[PDB]
Structures are given as structure tokens and as C-alpha cells.
Design a protein around this ligand. Sequence first.
Ligand SMILES: Nc1ncnc2c1ncn2[C@@H]1O[C@H](COP(=O)(O)OP(=O)(O)OP(=O)(O)O)[C@@H](O)[C@H]1O
Ligand SMILES: Nc1ncnc2c1ncn2[C@@H]1O[C@H](COP(=O)(O)OP(=O)(O)OP(=O)(O)O)[C@@H](O)[C@H]1O
Ligand SMILES: Nc1ncnc2c1ncn2[C@@H]1O[C@H](COP(=O)(O)OP(=O)(O)OP(=O)(O)O)[C@@H](O)[C@H]1O
Ligand SMILES: Nc1ncnc2c1ncn2[C@@H]1O[C@H](COP(=O)(O)OP(=O)(O)OP(=O)(O)O)[C@@H](O)[C@H]1O
Ligand SMILES: Nc1ncnc2c1ncn2[C@@H]1O[C@H](COP(=O)(O)OP(=O)(O)OP(=O)(O)O)[C@@H](O)[C@H]1O
Lengths: 318, 320, 319, 311, 315, 310
Amino acid sequence: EVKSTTKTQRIASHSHVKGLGLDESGLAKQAASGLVGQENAREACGVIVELIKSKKMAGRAVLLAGPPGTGKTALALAIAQELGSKVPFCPMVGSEVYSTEIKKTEVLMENFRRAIGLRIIQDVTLHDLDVANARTEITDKLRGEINKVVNKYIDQGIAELVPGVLFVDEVHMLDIECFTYLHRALESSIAPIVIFASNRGNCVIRGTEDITSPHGIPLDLLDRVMIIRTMLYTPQEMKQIIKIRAQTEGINISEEALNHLGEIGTKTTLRYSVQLLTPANLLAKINGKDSIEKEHVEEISELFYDAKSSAKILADQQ
Amino acid sequence: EVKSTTKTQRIASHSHVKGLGLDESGLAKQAASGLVGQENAREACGVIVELIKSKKMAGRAVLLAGPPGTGKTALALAIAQELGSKVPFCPMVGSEVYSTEIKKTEVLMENFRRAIGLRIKIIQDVTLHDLDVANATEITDKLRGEINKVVNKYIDQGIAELVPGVLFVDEVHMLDIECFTYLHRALESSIAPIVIFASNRGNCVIRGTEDITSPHGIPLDLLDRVMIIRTMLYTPQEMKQIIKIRAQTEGINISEEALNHLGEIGTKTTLRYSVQLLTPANLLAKINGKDSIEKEHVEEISELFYDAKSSAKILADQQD
Amino acid sequence: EVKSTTKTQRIASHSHVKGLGLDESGLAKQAASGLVGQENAREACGVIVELIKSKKMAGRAVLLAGPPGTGKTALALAIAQELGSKVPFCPMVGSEVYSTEIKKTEVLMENFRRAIGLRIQDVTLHDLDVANARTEITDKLRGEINKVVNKYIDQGIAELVPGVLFVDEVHMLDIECFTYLHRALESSIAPIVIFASNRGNCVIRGTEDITSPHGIPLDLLDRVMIIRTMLYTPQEMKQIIKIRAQTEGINISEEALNHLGEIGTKTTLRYSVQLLTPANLLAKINGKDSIEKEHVEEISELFYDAKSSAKILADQQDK
Amino acid sequence: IGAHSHIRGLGLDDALEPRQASQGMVGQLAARRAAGVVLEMIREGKIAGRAVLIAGQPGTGKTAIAMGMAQALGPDTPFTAIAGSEIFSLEMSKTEALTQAFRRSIGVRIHTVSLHEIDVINSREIKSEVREQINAKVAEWREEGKAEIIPGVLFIDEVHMLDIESFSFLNRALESDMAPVLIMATNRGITRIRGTSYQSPHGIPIDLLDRLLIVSTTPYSEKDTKQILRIRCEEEDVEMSEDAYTVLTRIGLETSLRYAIQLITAASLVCRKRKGTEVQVDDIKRVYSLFLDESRSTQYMKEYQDAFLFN
Amino acid sequence: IGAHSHIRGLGLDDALEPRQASQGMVGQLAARRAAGVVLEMIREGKIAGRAVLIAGQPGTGKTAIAMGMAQALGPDTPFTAIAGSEIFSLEMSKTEALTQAFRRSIGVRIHTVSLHEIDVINSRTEIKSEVREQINAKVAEWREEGKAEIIPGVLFIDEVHMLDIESFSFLNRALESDMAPVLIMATNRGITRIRGTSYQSPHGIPIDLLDRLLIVSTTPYSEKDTKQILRIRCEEEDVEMSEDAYTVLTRIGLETSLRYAIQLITAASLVCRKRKGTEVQVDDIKRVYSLFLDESRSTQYMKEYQDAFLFNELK
Amino acid sequence: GAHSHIRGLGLDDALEPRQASQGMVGQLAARRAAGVVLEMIREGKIAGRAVLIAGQPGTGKTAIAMGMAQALGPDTPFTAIAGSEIFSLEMSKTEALTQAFRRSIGVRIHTVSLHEIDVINSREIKSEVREQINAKVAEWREEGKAEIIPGVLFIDEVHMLDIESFSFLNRALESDMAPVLIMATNRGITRIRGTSYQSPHGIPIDLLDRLLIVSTTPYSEKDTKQILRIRCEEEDVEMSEDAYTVLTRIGLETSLRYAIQLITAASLVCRKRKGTEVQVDDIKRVYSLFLDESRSTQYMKEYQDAFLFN
Ligand SMILES: Nc1ncnc2c1ncn2[C@@H]1O[C@H](COP(=O)(O)OP(=O)(O)OP(=O)(O)O)[C@@H](O)[C@H]1O
Ligand SMILES: Nc1ncnc2c1ncn2[C@@H]1O[C@H](COP(=O)(O)OP(=O)(O)OP(=O)(O)O)[C@@H](O)[C@H]1O
Ligand SMILES: Nc1ncnc2c1ncn2[C@@H]1O[C@H](COP(=O)(O)OP(=O)(O)OP(=O)(O)O)[C@@H](O)[C@H]1O
Ligand SMILES: Nc1ncnc2c1ncn2[C@@H]1O[C@H](COP(=O)(O)OP(=O)(O)OP(=O)(O)O)[C@@H](O)[C@H]1O
Ligand SMILES: Nc1ncnc2c1ncn2[C@@H]1O[C@H](COP(=O)(O)OP(=O)(O)OP(=O)(O)O)[C@@H](O)[C@H]1O
């Protein structure tokens, strides 16, 4: 019957990402499958895709190391797209584990279950099955029931297990104990492909206080990790992505406005620029305008701020 | 029937403070109602008194900022006196909340209940805490609910009237972020006492924050609702004047030469230190078969006993 | 019936220590009772022995202070020997109290019980604890043994022999442990507590700010009698290594021993003594009756001392 | 009498342009216009997965703008303003404090009643089972059509006070379909995130910052300060001379607007105590000597501690 | 044998003037006189809401003065001396440790028995909260009857700077009681942080408690006073000693500590006993000094060692 | 497996290292010393001792530990864990270490580790369950139907352990069936976790004083090539000599881990274009695609430093 637990608000910004856009050989195209530029990282993800498909990602994980708004998430989603469409993708933030009412293990177990799917053609994730049985609370006793049901369906041949992609952003935020929980899960046969993301260099491993390691990841886990670098976009790659977003969302934008919106990206991040589209559109609609023009973008960019510049304003006043 | 829970040891040093000693207009007199000098802080307390009486202290608290032994407590007691006598006054120290056997909330709840009184119509003057002990195993919040229902029915009937007093919190920088949240919330109530803080510090880290410095160690949220009154150091004339009231109050005779020396000890240390020398100095005179305290007695007691600052200095110097 | 709980692996390195080797007067002999040199510390332990025997160690403890591998443990064992042969000796390390599954009090309680014996059957209070449990050694089970033991003493069938509790790495005990020791040290039937330190002033664990000598609270340190142990002369170094070689039934050339003595001067006596076993096996592999200089030199090159192995790394980490 | 009693809206025309003085709002033009664009987003339903940060120095109308937005959204729209430090309670979990703050900002139409009021009614921290029942109760009423869920405004001042544990709560909280519009305020630039060893603009985790519409309030001029004081006097029912307003604004600019406003009540009493009719300069001058501004309060304490250090 | 066995009172005359050598006390005149003024306050019932602080270097008779005051108050008056560090226990709450310390200093007359002994009697045959509550009601009945008399004694807290605000607040609540003993604390520390706080205060005591103190200072001993203390201690420990030896032991005492000098008496006598001797000679004191080290020599040697291996970290 | 090629220490009867034997290449001194340790395990002279292999990462510390376990017997239980592995959400540091120990202690019938016996009579494992198995194995042993065969427990990243866990190992090694504990680190003087004190390798002095400390020296161009050559054979990867020359250079310039990591990736790049064997262009391309932990960070430093200047 299915219900789909999927947190759509997350993947909403990447509605346009349909794959890696690589050619027959494995080289990236300037713009293809929704992706613009970032050719080298895309080509590297291509190898990761073939290694997952060739069962050669034996206990290995991935780290996309790059500045914010360089498509680390977009690439992790494209990896899931390339694994076959209807392969689970579970994006999460390292800080999610820190909750007062929910245990670290429970945040992680849910996100892992959200990243492993089933093909019955009905496409369900292990977490959708957990809520279906609950709609008291998702106990580990309820998990044991589903696991026995699922394992009998596989052996019979009615359903097949599809392990997806678990994307963990702000990796430096996970504590030593969480990494131990991931590493152990990463050793399993039916595990998803864990994809980390970092814009930081050497960090103290959370829970150690003294111990600095690359990206804040314990060396034991980091030895099993494959690093892919994502880089900053030029104002043109920027403009191209913004144009795709505008098109996707069904927003009309003048090339002049888009050029200015691209250079705002260079000054701030691509994420900031993309986010200005909605307010800029509403301002145009208020002004009784069909499309977003340069004035609208300029006005929105003046009224609203980016965390860096808004914090700077404060420090300067201080 | 009543019993009175009141910790008399505390207010004992202020037995002489009978009010603010202000004139009809609202200006302070050099010496009046037991108070000497500190005219500006006294005048400011006068405004606070009228604001409390005019129901204009809506959610507002008071901070008395000044050096130790400048009558911050004496003024907070005078405010309670001026609110009309038999108005509760509950002096406390921020560090009281830190107990191993008693919860922070329970230390605060008790002190708030000690600061809100009742007038039963001979007129009986009871505090909400006197009623708590009057009932009692142990003062549980279930027992508090019983008294609160009893008290609320007496008010609506008209047999008893609720008199909210003054809750004086000294060493404010000692309360933690969670205590301030408990005070602020209580300060929002209609039947709450007037909270009077006292500081002798500037900017402090708020306890429980480790990084966060704010004036007097009070969270800015609460500090925005606080009215600051400055207390200042007494002149050597004002000093001798206070010491003499204390001597008179305690029924102690002191020579003007001894009092002059006792005044200058105050200037060097604190007024509190000077006042405290009166009892030992008197006993030394009684031992020497003397009617009053003379300069020799004061000089001898000042040499035998020390003030924290100078006793700590002695050690540090011996150590160096 | 007995069983003996005794952790033999610990005292194994001191199998040769049979007493303090003091003369009738109380002066130490160059080599006697297994002990070599360290004459002054030995003479001071002699006084401690007489004070324990004269009931003059009233609430007092002992601290042996010297560099590592200067026989502080060997002396604490010799004190126990000199007290009366089958007198308990319980060597422990301050860090033992820090266990996840066992409470600090329980680590200390066990070691104290391991240090107080009964007398001919010679049993320790801890051997009696396990004899009953062979669920778990509860303090309710301890109360049963204590009543049984106290009735045997009053009857005259058994006599209580308080031994020596040796606590090494003292700076590792926390303020709360010292409070547990001090309180136990006040008892009449308590063992003689012997602390060991190679540290100067330390922060008392559990205080964070508070520095005191050897990391011992001043309250306890005032009840403590300090004996200094010193580094061995290269002549004394070779003498000790030879006793150890003899004890283990190992043949060693005087040339190899001389080199093994100088290794000790460079590292510690403990390091040198420990090279004997691998050096012997290398000789046995090479079909040799005794350890020669080559064997010692080879073992000293293959194996390292913590200081020099850590230095190797730090230097590689620089290049 | 409330502090934002005069604020009745954002004072903007159909084109979202601020009117300088309208709906109780004076100056603070760009931030007001920006707050208006945010309203259009709430109304069009384009605020999902986003929040607002009003970044500015104290007494720049961050709370006033948040208030104007809530008034502008509807007459019944639930507005809840809390301090970051208020969640650190003796009798309450940080999250339970925040849960209450959220349920206070979510209304139920029948007379509109907040989810929190419904909890208090079926209670005396609130029981986990009690909320679970009300959540099922309101789900039935909504699907029936007898009740309407009206999400309001939750304002968190001193936002830098929050730790990751509470920051993560807000993320989970905003995932709900009936989640209110979260407006947060701060006067802090880059600060460490509480509960972490990491620094971030406004002490907010980067994942949450990347989702914000950051509005910045600029400090007031002598003209705007006078107008706020003038408005506040009217609300507190205080008559004041023009020369006095001139002095009180100067005090306000040199100290704080909070302190200048705090003086009104006190100055009027000083005036009332001598007939007066209206507050004069000498009334403002006397009340300034009587009560201290926090800057003066600490400066005197520094002078004290420093003098005892030298002697 | 106790450390303060010789102390039989403060040894002052009717005019509260110290007698140089009387009632087991020697010198320390100023502190003894001030302790006498405090006694008059205890007796005149003018000590309510106050306590005593004896600030002075170690081995200056801070405990001895406190002991003297307890002896002078009465022959049966309960005296309890504890170290600050002693309340930090594995088997006990800081407050429960302090509760026991307080109830040890509060006596009940019949033979006089401390409230704490009454707790132990009606317990093990940490104390139960219900047990104390019963005894508190039991003693209240006996007192109102007239069959028992509550006699508050002396509680001495050495190393007071070891206490945290949690325990400092306990003392305030504890001193509120009508049967509360006279609290005398001691320290050798000046301005230190208050444990449990980020704030510094004289002697590490909260300002609210300092403002209620009667602060007394113990000055260090001269060669004459040191000899007299050792001479007294020998008599108590039953040790015969030569005059040339006393001369040496006092020098050791002044150069090291009085504690170390006293520590040597027991050991020196044994060295003497082991060779006949009859009385402790200089050679006995000299030998026992070489055998056992004072805490200063002990640490200097360890510093020299640790510092030499630190310079090795370079070569 | 990563150490699939390691079949022993590759030593002769005189405990002299063979340069290339039993899957082991170079690292001669460290190997000979490991052989001395074996003689002690066999002669029963290892009681109250433990091994430490101090050395930089990728110097065969784990490989030597594996070689010792292979040489001790074909059935000898070998368990290799990281120090950070005991810090678990679902497990006590000691319970994590108890499992690590019981995995290294075997029972002969087919050989089965004490830990397997726990898992069989279970689904953290119950304290009562272990207590029963400990009594069960005691009966089987005294009967003669079962033989207790202590193996090898390898704790890599040992500096990660705190005193609480260091004290556990001391108690653990007191047992008669205790396995030979082999610890490894690449750290010099460091603070002991859970303490305010510094010690070589971050190990308490009481445990250091009982250690047989071996040092692994870094590999030459020759030894590095030989390790990669061996690893290719295990991963079934054909490679050109010019490529091996490049991959060893990458290995020396970066890490052996990274150069090994590239093999799988380089072969796929080659497979995706026919190739037959991995060429230089394949190694070169795969190097540009995936970064080594140091290039990874240098780029993150360059980024943060550029935003600091602006
Ligand atoms: N190469 C690309 N081609 C097309 N769209 C892209 C590309 N890179 C990024 N985007 C889009 O630009 C936006 C920002 O990218 P993304 O969110 O994946 O970056 P990030 O590096 O993971 O950092 P962050 O999540 O903190 O903003 C999204 O809308 C994303 O889908
Ligand atoms: N203006 C005053 N007139 C008369 N008595 C005063 C005056 N100021 C202070 N006193 C008295 O002098 C003493 C010290 O004053 P008080 O205790 O109120 O000061 P404080 O500033 O609150 O500081 P602290 O409580 O730490 O000693 C008390 O006996 C008090 O009653
Ligand atoms: N004076 C001595 N005479 C004979 N054997 C000695 C002597 N001193 C030490 N030894 C022996 O040398 C070795 C090292 O001495 P010991 O272990 O007692 O020293 P330590 O100072 O306590 O330091 P550590 O325990 O940290 O190695 C042991 O085998 C011990 O028995
Ligand atoms: N003035 C004195 N008269 C007689 N005996 C004294 C005198 N001062 C000290 N003593 C004795 O000398 C010893 C040391 O005195 P005491 O223990 O009181 O010193 P202290 O200042 O309290 O230092 P601490 O207790 O920290 O060691 C004790 O045996 C004590 O009785
Ligand atoms: N001397 C050697 N002979 C054969 N193979 C070796 C040798 N040294 C290392 N290897 C192999 O190279 C790889 C790295 O070795 P290893 O993992 O043991 O290094 P390490 O020093 O333990 O460092 P780390 O485990 O921290 O990555 C493994 O596949 C290992 O089997």
C-alpha cells in the first residue's frame, strides 16, 4: 500500500538533479542530467557508482570535501539517481544526533532504515514499513518483526532489497561514539553507501577534546573513506544552475537579473543566490511583473542578508 | 495562633532601621528613621516605594549597586518598613540555592513564601511560610496546594488580606541562569513580592553559561526589567554617626575618642567591620571594669581581630 | 583448607628479595638478604620495621620517594619479609581504582583485605572472602567472615597478622581515595600503607587546581614518613642483574653483564633486568650455554625502552 | 501596560513600502519593508523550511518588527515571544520549554485557543501521553471541519543562548505541517555555538543559517528616538514638555532606548509628587541622577575594584 | 597518644591576659588573648550567627588554640577537629560528612554523649534520615523533661579552603540551629578561588560568611617557643632527651616544620633504645634526620630528577 | 582481506628475516624481534607481559601482528581492533574489550572462540550468560574433551584508550587463558586519556614497564613496490611496470594506504576502456579523481586562509 516517510523539504532544492550526466566512457559533460560544471567530482562519483555496482565498495565510504554550496549534496543525490531511480537517498546533518528526547542510536538507526529500500512494482524503504506498523512508538521490538517479515519475502522472491545512499553533512559534528556506530554498520552486507561531506580541514574529534584528525573523522574510519573534492563555481556555472532552478520552479528571470544573481553567488554562496529567487519573484508579482528583473534582485539582495555579512554588520557596529 | 519562621539573626544588625527618613516632599534628611547619609539612594528608594504603592512596579525589580557595607541591605529593609509595618522582608544570599540535600527551586520557593504575608481581621500578621510549617512530615508541594486553597478562600470571603513584601537577594552574581529564569517567571505574577537585588561587582559571567558576561552577572532579559540604585561609601562623619546609632541600639557606651578611631577603622576596612568590633570592645571594657568603651579597648580589639582582606594579606606576605 | 588469591606475577620480579639484610645493630650490608646497595633507604626501612613491631606506627604511613627502578617496591616487599615471613604484601597501582565495572571502594576494600592475614595455616582476609564465593563478594558476605574471624581470635585458635599494602603511582589516587585510606589507616587492625612516588608537587586528582607534594593531600602527608631511594652505581647495577640472572637460572658472561649494567644506567634497572629472558632465548636459539655480549647487544637493538621508542617516533614525525 | 502596545502593524502600503510613521511604527524602514516581503511569503505559503533572523543592536525594534508581523498576519494569530535564556529552567527540560513555546504559537478555532492552553486545561512540564491525546483529538476536529489550525509566530530573542540540543529541536519542530513562523533575534556577530567548540554567525548552526531570511535593523536617529519616546509616553499616559523630550532622547542615544523609556514612569511620578502638570527637564534630570543605566552601574563598580587594586 | 594531649586550656588570667607558659600552651600570646575574648562571647551568649577563623602558617597552634578554647569551655565540652578534604568521601555525602562532624560536637548530658554517638547506637548494631529525625524528637522530649541537657561544643575545620559553596551553604544552615556548636575554621591561604565557583576570596571563604567571622592570626614560633613545644611533646610521648639534642631538633624544626621535628621524636627514641642510650643525643637526631626526609627535601629531590630528564627531551 | 597475503613472519629456524617470505617484505628488524616474542609465547615466558609495535602508519604493524598469529598456529584466534572502536553507543568500554578478549580465546572440539559460544547462548552479552559459559568451559577442559587455545588480540590506535580501559587490560591479562596482547601506535609522548598526565605512546607507566617494544621503520621505494605488487596479486589486478613505478612514487609521497586504495579504482578505470593491464594514465587519472588525506586538508586550509584575507 505504501505511505512514504521521505522528508521532501530536504531534496526539494535538488529536484533538477537527475543523474551525473557522464558520457558512455565516463567523462562529464559541461551541463547534463541537471548537473552543471563540477566535472572532476562528477567523474569521480561515476567511478564510485561502478564500484558500488561491481560490489567493490567492500566496507568503503565516501567523503565529498569542498566549500559550502558546491553541490556536495547534489552529487550525493546524483549518485543515488545513477544507482537506479527509486534507490533511497537519506540526507542528514551530523548535529541531528544531538536531541534531548531521542537517543543518538535511534537518530542513526532511523536514517539507516530510511536509506535501505525494498522492491516488491512497489518501492518502499525499511523506515516506511516501520511507521506502517505504528500507524504506539517505533521500538526495536517492532524492528525485529519487520526484519523477519522482510527476510522471508526476499528468500521467497516476492521482494528484493535495494540499499541506497546515506548522506551525512557537517560530519565534524558527529561524536567518536557515532563514528563507531557508522563504521560497524558500514561493515554489514545490506548497508547503504555512506557519503560524508566537509568544508573543514583538521578538527578535534567530538568526544575527545584534544584529538585533531582530518574533517573531524577518526583515522580508523578515514582509512576506509575515499575523498572527492568539490570546487567553487565560476559566475557562469553559477548562473546556469540558478537558471535551471528558476526553470524547475517555473520562475521567469531576465538574463540581466540572472547575471547579477550569479555575481551575488560569487560574493556569498550559490545556495544564497538560489534562495533569493522566491522573494525576488514575489516582489515582481507585487510590482505586477511577469518576470524577475535586475531591480527586483537588487532590492531583495539589499533587504535580506547572508549570515556572514549580517554578522559582520553587527561586529562593525560593536 | 502564628509561630513566626523569621530568621532574626539576619535583620539583627538593622534593628535601628525604621524607614527611609524622607520628608513630606520626598527628600532625605541627613539622619532620620535610623538612616544616616546615603541621601540619594534613600530618595531613589522613596520613588520605588511610591511606584510599588501606585501599582507602577509592573513586572519590575530593583538592584542596589554599591561597595560592601554601604547599606544596600539596610535600604532594602527600609523599603519594606516604608511599605507599612508588618510587611515581610526576606534577606537571602545567592549562594543559598547551592545545597546538596535541598533543590534550588525549594530554596527559592521557601524564600518567596517567606516574603508574601497575610493580614487576618487584634490583627494577625502571618507569612505564607509560617503557614507551611504550621501544617507540618515535610513541607511538600502537595501541602503548599492545601494552604493556597485555604488562603484564596479567606481573601475572597474578606477575613484575610494578602500583603506581598520584599525579597532581598544579595550576592546576585552567585545565582545561576536557571534561578534567574525561576525569579523572572515569579516576578511576572500579580501576588509576587518586590525582588531587590544587590551587587558590588561589575560585569560577570552568568553562572551556568561559562562564557557569557553581563552586568552584575544578571541575564539581560531580567536586567531590562531592573531599576538600578547606586549606594556609596560613607564619609568619616557619616561613619561615626552610624557606629553611634549601633552602639546606642545595643545599649553600649562609647567615648568620642574611641568612636573617632572606630570611624577611621571603617574607612580603612568596611562599616560592617567597625560595627562588629563594638561587642568585643565592650566585653574588654567590662573585663577591665569600665563603664564605657575607650580608645585603648578599640585599639586592642582592632589588633587582636582582623578583617578578611588584611588577614589574607598577612598570609600572602609571610608566604612571599 | 586455604586457596591463596595472591597475584604472583607482580612479586615475581622480586623473588630474590628475602629481607632488608641489616646487621644486629641495624646497619645495611653492601649485599645481604637479596638486596644490593641502597643502604640508607634499607636502614630507614629497618626503623619502620621496629616502629611497626613496637606499636609506634600509630596512624602513620610510609612514602618511598625515588626515581623508577630504584627498588621502592623491592624495599616495601622486604619490609613485609622482615615483619614475619608469611606476612601479607599487596602491591597495587593508584590507577587500579579506575575501573568501569568495579567501584573505587571495592578495589580498595579488596586490596586492604588482601593485606591483612590470619595465622599452622596462613590465610589472608581476601582468601576467606573467595573461599565462600567459590555469587559475588558482597559487603554482607564480608560481615559474616568478620564475625567468624573475631570469634576465632577471642577463642585463641587464630591470630590476626596485618601486612603491607604497597600503593605505587600515588599521584593517580583521587581526593576521595585518600579519604578512604586515611580513615582505614586510623584502624587498629590495619596494614602498614606504603606509598611510592617519583614525582614532585602534583595536582591532587579531583581538585584540578590544588598542588601538593607527590599529589598526596596535606592532611594525609602529615601522617607520612618519607624514605628516599637513589639511583644505583654501575657496580651495584651489575650486582642486581646478576642476582636476577641467578634467580631465573640464567648463565651470563661478565662482559654481557657489564653491557647490561650500562644499558640500565642509560634506561632503568627494570629495563635491563627484563632483557635477560629474550637475551637467553636468543643464546638458546644460537645453541649457546650462556648469554654473551652479542646476544645482549642484539636484544637491546631489536627491543626498545618507552622513552627511546617514543623519541624515534617524534624524530620521524619531524623529518 | 505592554511594551509593544502601540504596534498595530508594519505600517506599509499595498506595494510593501514603509510609511515612516504608521500602525505604531516609526522609521526602521528597510527592516520593516523586509518584514513585509516575509509576510507575503507566509501568505503565499512559500515559507516552508525557512525562518527569520532579525539581526541588530538592542532597542532597534527587533521585537517590535516581530510584533508588527504577528498583528499584520491576523487579529487572532498566536504570537509568543520568549528569551533564549528562558528555556534554561529548574522545573523544565530545554525541549519541553521549547515545546510549550511552539504549542503557544499554534492556534485552534472553535474563539481561538492555542494548543498549549488545551494542554494546561487537560493537565493541572506537561505529560507526554496528554499531548499525544490532544494531537489525536485536534486531528479528528480538523478532519471533521469543526476546528481550524491557525499557525502563528514564535519569537526567540537572545537566540545565541540556545545550544545544539535545542537548535536540533527547532529543526524537528519546523518539520511539522502546523509549525508556526519562527522569528529569532540577536545582537551578536560570530560567537561559539553553545554545546559546541565551533563559532558561527549569531551563534546559529550553519545548517539553520543556510535556511534563514536575515533582516537587519539599523540604530535610531535623534528624530526616530524622540518619536518612539513620544509614542511610549502616549501609551503610558504621560504628558511631557518639548525641552524634556529633547533631554530624554539625548539620554536615550547616550545610554539605551530601554533606559530612556524606563525613566518615563519614574519622571512622571517625580512630576506628580510636585503637581507639575507635565514632565519638565529638571524632572528628567533628577530621575537620571536617582536611577542608573547599566553602563554607569558597571563603570562605578570598575572604578571601585580598580581603586582597591592600586592602594 | 593524642597530638594536643598537653593542651588543658588557653591559660589566661581573669583579665584575659596570656601567661607565656600555662595550661599546656606556650607563647602564641596575641592569638591566645583573642581566643579568650571569643570565649567571653560564647559565655555571654553573644556568638550567635558568628564563627571563628584562625589564619596562620602550618604548625602555629591553630588546632592547639581551638583545642584550648574547648578545654576552657568545660571538661565535658565536645571537641571535633576535621580536615576540609575529609568531607570528600567515597562512602559519604559532603553534607552527611559535615552533619556527622556537627552532631559529634553537640553533647547530651545524663555521663555526656554526643548526638552522633546516639545515632551510631540506634543504627549499625552514612546514617539514616529517619533515624536522625527520631533522635531529634527523642532529645527534644528529654530536654523539655529536664532529664537531659544539650551542651554545644566546638567544631574545628582545618584546611577550610578545601570546602565548596555547597558545603559552605551547609554550614550557614547548620549554624542557624539553637544547639549549633561554635565553629572554628583554620587556613594558611590568602586570596584563593572559592571551590565550586569562578570567584576569588580571602581564605577561599564566601564573603557572606567572612563578614560574620572573628578572624585570628597565629604568628610563627621563635627558637625558644619551638624548643618549649618539643620539650612538652617529648614529655607526652615519654621521651628523655639531651639539651644539645633539643638545640638541634629545634633547628631542624625551624628550618623544616614543627610537624617534621615532632615526627622525629618517636623515631629518634627508637634509634636511642636500639643502642641503650638512656636519653636521645645529637647523633640520634642527626641519624634519624638522614634516614627520614621532610616534605620540602623530598620534593626538591623529585624536582631535580624530573627537571634533569626534561632537559634530556632536548639532547 | 587487507592482510590476505600474510602467511607468517617468513623467518628461518635461527629467527633471521628472509627479506621476502610468507607474504612479508622487508621490515627486517621488526620481523626478527617479533620472532623473539614468538619464542617467549611458545616457551611460556610471556606471562605478565604485552607487545607494542611503535611505528608510523602503513609500516606493517598490523601485518607483523597477523604474521605472529599465523606463525603461532593455523587455528590460533586473531582479533584486530582500533582503540576508538571501544567507544560505542550500544556498549560499555569494558564490555567492548571483554568481547575483543573472548574473540581471541579459542575452544577446541573444530575451534570456536569464547565469544562465539556467548553469541550462540544469547541472541552487549549478559553477565550471567558469560558466568555459565566460564563454568561450562571449565568442566570441558578438566574433562579433556576441550582445549583452551589463547590467541592474539591486536589493539591498533592504542593511545585512544583511557585509564578505565587500561586498568581493564591489566585485570584481563591476569587470567590464565589470556591472549597475547599486541598494541600499536604512531604516537610519541601524549597525555593518557582520562588523565592530566603525559606518557610515551599515551600508555600508563605501569603497563609500559611490562612491554616488549618493537619499532617499525618506514619502507623504501623497493619495499613499497613489493607490497603493492603483492596487493595487486591478492586483488587480482594486472599492472604495467611503468604504472608500479608511478603508484610507488604516489605511495611514498602520500601513504601506502592511499596507493593501495587506488588499485581497485585504477583497475575499474582500465576495465571501463578494455586496457588488459593498468597503465600510467590509469594511475594518473585515478589520482586526480580521488584525494589523499593530506591534499584533502591542504585544499581546506587554502580555502579558509583565502576567506581570512578577504
Ligand atoms: N554542479 C551542479 N549542477 C547543478 N545544480 C547544482 C550543482 N551544484 C550545486 N547545485 C545546486 O545548487 C544548490 C547548492 O548546492 P548543494 O546544496 O548541493 O551544496 P553543498 O556543497 O552540499 O553545501 P550546503 O548544503 O551547505 O548549501 C542546490 O540547489 C543544488 O541542487
Ligand atoms: N545609611 C545608613 N544609615 C544607618 N545605618 C546604616 C546605613 N548604611 C548601613 N547601615 C548599617 O551599617 C551596617 C552595614 O550595612 P549593610 O549590611 O546594609 O551594607 P551592605 O552594603 O548591604 O553590605 P554587606 O551586607 O555585605 O555587609 C549595618 O549594621 C546597617 O544596618
Ligand atoms: N637494592 C636492590 N637489591 C636487589 N634487587 C633490587 C634492588 N633494587 C631493585 N631491585 C630489583 O630491580 C628491579 C627494579 O626495582 P623495583 O621494581 O622495586 O623499583 P621501583 O623503584 O619500585 O620502580 P618500578 O616499579 O616503576 O620499576 C626488581 O627486579 C627489583 O626486585
Ligand atoms: N602555642 C602552643 N603551645 C603548646 N603546644 C603547641 C602550640 N602550638 C602548637 N603546639 C603543638 O605543636 C603541634 C602543632 O600545632 P598545631 O597542629 O595546632 O598547628 P597548626 O597551626 O594547627 O597546623 P596544622 O594542624 O595544619 O599541622 C601540636 O602537637 C600542638 O599541640
Ligand atoms: N612488511 C610487509 N610485508 C607485506 N605486506 C605488508 C608489509 N607492511 C605492510 N604490508 C601491507 O600493507 C598494508 C599496510 O600495512 P599495515 O596496515 O599493517 O600498516 P600499519 O603500520 O599497521 O598501519 P595502519 O594499520 O594504521 O594503517 C596492508 O595491506 C599490509 O598487509
